[PDB]
Amino acid sequence: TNIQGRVYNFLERPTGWKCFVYHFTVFLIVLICLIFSVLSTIQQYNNLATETLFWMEIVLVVFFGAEYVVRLWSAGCRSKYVGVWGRLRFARKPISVIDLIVVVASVIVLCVGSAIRGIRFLQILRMLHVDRQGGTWRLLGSVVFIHRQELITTLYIGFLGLIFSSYFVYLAEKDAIDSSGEYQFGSYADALWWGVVTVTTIGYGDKVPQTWIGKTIASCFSVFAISFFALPAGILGSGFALKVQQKQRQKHFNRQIPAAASLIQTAWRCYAAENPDSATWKIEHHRAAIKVIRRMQYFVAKKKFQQARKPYDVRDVIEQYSQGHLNLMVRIKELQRRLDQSL
């Protein structure tokens, strides 16, 4: 029966309407819980909310436990996760682990209990549940990896600038007391903090350079530093845009098939090659040659598969042209030979 598979689909990797709705509902519930927690946190609505939380939180945790159990049960759909070991492996995955932590911690809290310190934290953690299959994070991670060389540089140089600016401001404004009667840059730590604020472009204004020289230095070292700090946001965005554009001009999925098949076949052939008295030895020196040829074919096949996987590009076009052109040339040569042969 296909029921387990269906269940798995519903729970993890869902494109279903009903499934989507369910997920949305869950998210909403989580949000509501968070809101309630927040309300409890402020003193004016503490006595009324605690009881409600006690009533609801336990139920929520039970529900989540049930869901987890169901998910575990459903793992058998995927052949990667079969038996006990497979299930353990599945559990090992990050989101699942997080969920487990949330549930067990919640249970512990309940046992301890209607005040609770860690419950708030658990609630916060819970919001991470909805990003199933790591589809949110993974993309971002990939993008970061792609643009790491530049991003890292930006982080570094900017950081250095910030440090330097902080130092300079400390040097400037050590002696200068504020109008309110308190030293703004007593410690270097304070200066550093100020610098961080400035580069961030938050501009709290708890600390501001008092001396004219200090002001001048801030003016000098701000703009560049600001630009540097803004860079990551920009660059990442650009990368994302580029990725989207690339996606927009992807190959069709049908073109990947034959190449893949070929690759598989070549792999099989290679495998056979080791086995001396196999069926694939159909159609010593000769054998050796054949092995080499098979390996070559496999290599070709892999390359082809990779190409298929990738999006369309100028290089691909060039390759295609080359392939065409050589063939045409060969044909022409053959024709010429035929002509010569006749005469």
Partner 1 sequence: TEEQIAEFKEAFSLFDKDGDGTITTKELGTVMRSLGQNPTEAELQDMINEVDADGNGTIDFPEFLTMMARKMKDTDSEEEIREAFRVFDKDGNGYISAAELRHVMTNLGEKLTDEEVDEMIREADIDGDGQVNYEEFVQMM
Minimum CB separation of residue 258 from its own copies in Å reads 16
Minimum CB separation of residue 152 from partner 1 in Å reads 23
The answer to the question of residue 290 lying near partner 1 (CB under 8 A) is yes
Q: What is the DSSP string of 136-197?
A: HHHHHHHHHHHTHHHHHHHHHHHHHHHHHHHHHHHHHSSS-B-TTSSBTTSSHHHHHHHHHH
Minimum CB separation of residue 255 from its own copies in Å reads 11
x/- contact string, 62-81, with partner 1 (CB under 8 A)? ---------------xxxx-
Partner that binds at residue 235, options its own copies, partner 1, none, CB closer than 5 to 8 Å by kind = its own copies
The answer to the question of residue 315 lying near partner 1 (CB under 8 A) is no
Q: What is the DSSP string of 216-236?
A: HHHHHHHHHHHHHHHHHHHHH
DSSP state of 131: S
Minimum CB separation of residue 227 from its own copies in Å reads 4
Which CB atom, from 105 or from 290, has the smaller least distance to partner 1?
Answer: 290
Q: Is 265 annotated as a binding residue?
A: no
The answer to the question of residue 88 lying near partner 1 (CB under 8 A) is no
The answer to the question of residue 254 lying near partner 1 (CB under 8 A) is yes
The answer to the question of residue 280 lying near partner 1 (CB under 8 A) is yes
For residue 74, give Cα distances in angstroms to 4, 65, 79, 117, 154: 5, 14, 11, 34, 45
Distance from chain centroid for Cα 321 = 37
Judged by CB under 8 A, which stretch of 57-65, 138-146, 188-196, 294-302 contacts partner 1?
A: 294-302
The answer to the question of residue 278 lying near partner 1 (CB under 8 A) is yes
CB atoms within 10 A of CB 172: 21
Minimum CB separation of residue 322 from partner 1 in Å reads 9
Q: Which two tokens stand for residue 46?
A: 């503490």
CB atoms within 10 A of CB 263: 20
186 phi and psi angles, rounded to 5 deg: -70, -50
119 contacts 109 by C-beta, under 8 angstroms:
yes
Considering only 127, 220, 292, 332, the residue that binds partner 1 (CB under 8 A) is 292
Which CB atom, from 73 or from 188, has the smaller least distance to its own copies?
Answer: 188
Q: In the range 215-234, which residues lie near partner 1 by CB under 8 A?
A: none
74 contacts 11 by C-beta, under 8 angstroms:
yes
Minimum CB separation of residue 314 from partner 1 in Å reads 18
Partner that binds at residue 296, options partner 1, its own copies, none, CB closer than 5 to 8 Å by kind = partner 1
In the chain, which ranges are E strands?
none
Considering only 261, 318, 332, 335, the residue that binds partner 1 (CB under 8 A) is 261
The answer to the question of residue 270 lying near partner 1 (CB under 8 A) is yes
Partner that binds at residue 257, options its own copies, partner 1, none, CB closer than 5 to 8 Å by kind = partner 1
Minimum CB separation of residue 31 from its own copies in Å reads 11
Partner that binds at residue 201, options its own copies, partner 1, none, CB closer than 5 to 8 Å by kind = its own copies
Which CB atom, from 216 or from 323, has the smaller least distance to partner 1?
Answer: 323
For 19, how many CA atoms within 13 A lie in the half-sphere containing its CB? 13
Could you report how far apart the first and last alpha carbons of the chain are, in Å?
Answer: 73
Closest Cα to residue 143, out of 223, 275, 237, 73? 237
The residues, any chain, with a CB within 8 Å of residue 229's CB and separated by 6 or more, are 158, 199, 200, 201
Q: For binding to partner 1 (CB under 8 A), which residues are involved?
A: 5, 13, 77-80, 252, 254-268, 270-272, 278-280, 282-283, 285-286, 288-290, 292-293, 295-303, 305-306, 309, 323, 326-327, 330
Could you list the residues known to form a binding site, using ranges: 133
